[PDB]
Amino acid sequence: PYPWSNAQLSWQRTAFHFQPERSWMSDPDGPIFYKGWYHFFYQYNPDNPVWGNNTWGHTVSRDLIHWLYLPLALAADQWYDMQGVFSGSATCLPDGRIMMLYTGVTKEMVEMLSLAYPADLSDPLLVEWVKYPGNPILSAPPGVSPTEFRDASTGWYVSNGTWRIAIGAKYNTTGIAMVYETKDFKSFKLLEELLHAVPDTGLWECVDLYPVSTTGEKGLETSVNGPKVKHVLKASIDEQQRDYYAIGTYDLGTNKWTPDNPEEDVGIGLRYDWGKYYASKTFYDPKKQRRVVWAWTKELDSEVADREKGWANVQTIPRTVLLDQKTGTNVLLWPVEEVESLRLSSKEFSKVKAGAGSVVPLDVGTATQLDIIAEFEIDKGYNCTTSGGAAERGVLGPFGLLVSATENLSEQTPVYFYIAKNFKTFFCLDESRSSKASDVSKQVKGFTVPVLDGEKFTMRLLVDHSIVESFAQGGRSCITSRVYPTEAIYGAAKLFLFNNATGASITASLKIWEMNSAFIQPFH
Ligand SMILES: *[C@@H]1O[C@H](CO)[C@@H](O[C@@H]2O[C@H](CO)[C@@H](O[C@@H]3O[C@H](CO[C@H]4O[C@H](CO)[C@@H](O)[C@H](O)[C@@H]4O)[C@@H](O)[C@H](O[C@H]4O[C@H](CO)[C@@H](O)[C@H](O)[C@@H]4O)[C@@H]3O[C@H]3OC[C@@H](O)[C@H](O)[C@H]3O)[C@H](O)[C@H]2NC(C)=O)[C@H](O[C@@H]2O[C@@H](C)[C@@H](O)[C@@H](O)[C@@H]2O)[C@H]1NC(C)=O
Ligand SMILES: *[C@@H]1O[C@H](CO)[C@@H](O[C@@H]2O[C@H](CO)[C@@H](O[C@@H]3O[C@H](CO)[C@@H](O)[C@H](O)[C@@H]3O)[C@H](O)[C@H]2NC(C)=O)[C@H](O)[C@H]1NC(C)=O
Ligand SMILES: *[C@@H]1O[C@H](CO)[C@@H](O[C@@H]2O[C@H](CO)[C@@H](O)[C@H](O)[C@H]2NC(C)=O)[C@H](O[C@@H]2O[C@@H](C)[C@@H](O)[C@@H](O)[C@@H]2O)[C@H]1NC(C)=O
Ligand SMILES: *[C@@H]1O[C@H](CO)[C@@H](O)[C@H](O)[C@H]1NC(C)=O
C-alpha cells in the first residue's frame, strides 16, 4: 500500500480525455448526434469513486473533444430502477423521435428493460429526460436469468415499421445474442432464432451489430444493408472484462449473423483494443459520415487511492471504425480527427539511429500531454502476456518508445514492436516498471499486428497523464493502458527511443506534438 501524495494523485487527472468533475464513471450510454451537438451519456455514481449507485451522466460537445457537463440525465428514482439505471442505447426514428432503451434494476436485483425519451425534442441540449409511464416494458425470457438480462442495442430497421434490437446473454456457458422486434419501442416480441451464439464465451454484454463498407471510406447508418455491406458483431465478454468483435454478414430474412472466419468468432478472435477497454458502443455520425466508437478505461490502481483522490475511470478518445480494406480481416480504429485540434507545437526527429541495446533520449520538453507519430525500419512461441516485456531481448526486438519515464529509467512504460521467427510482428505495452508503487497493474499487454509488404513499423501514441493510448499500423491493433508513476510526473516525465534487440539496429522518424487541454467544464 503505497503512500500517495496530493501532487501524485492530482497529476493523474487527464488534460484532454473525458471524465466528470469527481466520482465514478463507467459504461458509455446512448451516444447520439443531435441538432449540432454530440451527446454522450455515461454510468455515474454520484456518491463515491466506486461502482455504483447507477445514474446516467450527460455531457455535450461540438467536436467530440471539447465536452461540457450537463445536469444528470436519468436517476435511480423509480421502483423498477431504484438499484440503478444500467446501460442502454438510443434509436432515432424517422419522425424525429429519440427512443432511449435502458436496463433498470429493482432492489431485488432483478433487471428489466425500460424506455426513456426527451421531454422536449426542440431542445438541442436534451437536458430533461422522461421515463415512459408504462415502465418496465420487458422482463427476462424463460432461458435467461432475470438477474442477468441487460444491455439493449441500437435498433435497426426491417420493414412495415418493424425495428430490431439485440440483447446479449447466455445459455449455460454459451454466449448468445437475442433479437426482439418492436414497432413503437414500448412492446417487444422475442424472435425464435438467435442472432448468433458461441460456445465457451460466457455472458455477452453490450452486443453491437453494425454495417461496414467494403468500398467506401465512410461509416454507414445502422439500418444500411446490401451486397457490398459487411456486418460487425461485437460483444463485451463479462468473464474477461474484455471487448471482442468479428467480421461477417447479416441477413435480414433469416435474422442470422455468420462469421467470415469461424475460428475468430465473437469472443474467441479479435479485440478492438488489447489493453484496458470495455463496454464499447458505436453510433453513426451523420455530419462527417463516420461510425464512432466509445469505451471506458477502468483505473488500474488500488481502490484506496481512488477513494483518496475522489474519482475513478476515464473514457478513451472516441475512435472511428472502418473495415481494414488492405487486409479485409480486421477493423481500423483511429482517434477522431478533432483530437488534432488539441495539437500545439511539433518537434521532428528525422532518421534517428538506435543500435542494439540502446536508449536514445527524446528532448521534447514536458512529456505528459503528447501525440506521437513514429515510423520504424530495420537496417541492412512469443506472446506479449507471458513475455518479460522490454527486458526480454530477442534477435529482432523489442524496440520502440519509452513513455512516462524518469531521467534514469527508474520508472518506464515501453510501447514496442517485437518481430518473431513466416514472420509474426508483435505490438505490446509493458506496465511492469511503470511505477515504483507495488499496488498497481504490472502487466504486459498486446497481440500480433499485420504488417504488409512495403509498410514500415508505425505507432501512434496518445499520452495524457495517467492514460496511454497506442495504435499500430494505422490502428489495426490498439493498446490502451493506465500508468501511475511516482517519480515520472510533471517536469520529470521524459521520453525515449529504445532498441533492445540483440542483432538489429533500427532507424526511426518521429513527430511529437504537445497537446492542449480540452477545457472540460460545466455548460455555460
Ligand atoms: C498468451 O498467454 C496468455 C496467458 O497464458 C493467454 O491468455 C490466457 O488464456 C487462458 C486460456 O487459454 C485463460 O485461462 C482462463 O482463465 C479463467 C480465469 O481467469 C482468472 O484468472 C486469471 C489468472 O491467470 C486472471 O488474470 C483473470 O483476471 C481471471 O480472474 C478461467 O475461468 C477459464 O476457464 C473457463 O473458461 C474455459 C474456456 O473459456 C472453459 O473451459 C470453462 O468454462 C472455464 O470455466 C480459463 O482457464 C483456462 O486456463 C487454465 C486451463 O487449465 C483451463 O483448462 C483453461 O480453461 C487466461 O485467463 C488467459 N490469461 C490472460 C488473457 O491474461 C493467451 O491466450 C489468448 O488470450 C486469451 C484471453 C484467450 O482468448 C485465448 O483463446 C487466447 O489464445 C496467449 N495467447 C495466445 C495463445 O495466442
Ligand atoms: C533491455 O533488456 C535488459 C536485459 O534483460 C534489461 O535489463 C534487465 O532489467 C531487468 C528489469 O529491470 C532486471 O531484472 C531484475 O528485476 C527484479 C524485479 O523482480 C528487480 O528487483 C531486480 O533489481 C532486477 O532489476 C535485470 O537486472 C536487468 N538485466 C541486465 C543484464 O541489465 C534492460 O532494462 C532492458 N532495457 C530497457 C527495458 O529499456
Ligand atoms: C445447458 O445444459 C443443461 C445441462 O446439461 C441442458 O439440459 C440437459 O439437456 C439434455 C439434452 O437436451 C437432457 O437430456 C438433460 O436432461 C438436461 N439436463 C438438465 C440438468 O436439465 C440444457 O439444455 C436445455 O434444457 C433441456 C432440459 C432441454 O429443454 C434442452 O432443449 C435445452 O436446450 C442447456 N441449457 C440451455 C439453456 O441451453
Ligand atoms: C449509495 O448511496 C448511499 C447513501 O446515499 C451510500 O451510503 C452508499 O455507500 C452508496 N453506495 C455506493 C457509493 O456504492
Automatic annotation (TrEMBL):
Cellular component GO terms, alphabetical: vacuole
UniProt record, GO biological process: carbohydrate metabolic process
Residues in Glycosyl hydrolase family 32 C-terminal domain copies: 338-514
Glycosylation sites: 53
Gene Ontology molecular function: any one: transferase activity
Principal cellular location given in the protein's record: other
S-S pairs: 384-428
Stretches assigned to the Glycosyl hydrolase family 32 N-terminal domain: 17-335
Keywords: Glycosidase, Hydrolase, Membrane, Transferase, Transmembrane, Transmembrane helix, Vacuole
Locations listed in the record: Vacuole
Family of this protein: Belongs to the glycosyl hydrolase 32 family.
Protein name, per record: Sucrose:(Sucrose/fructan) 6-fructosyltransferase
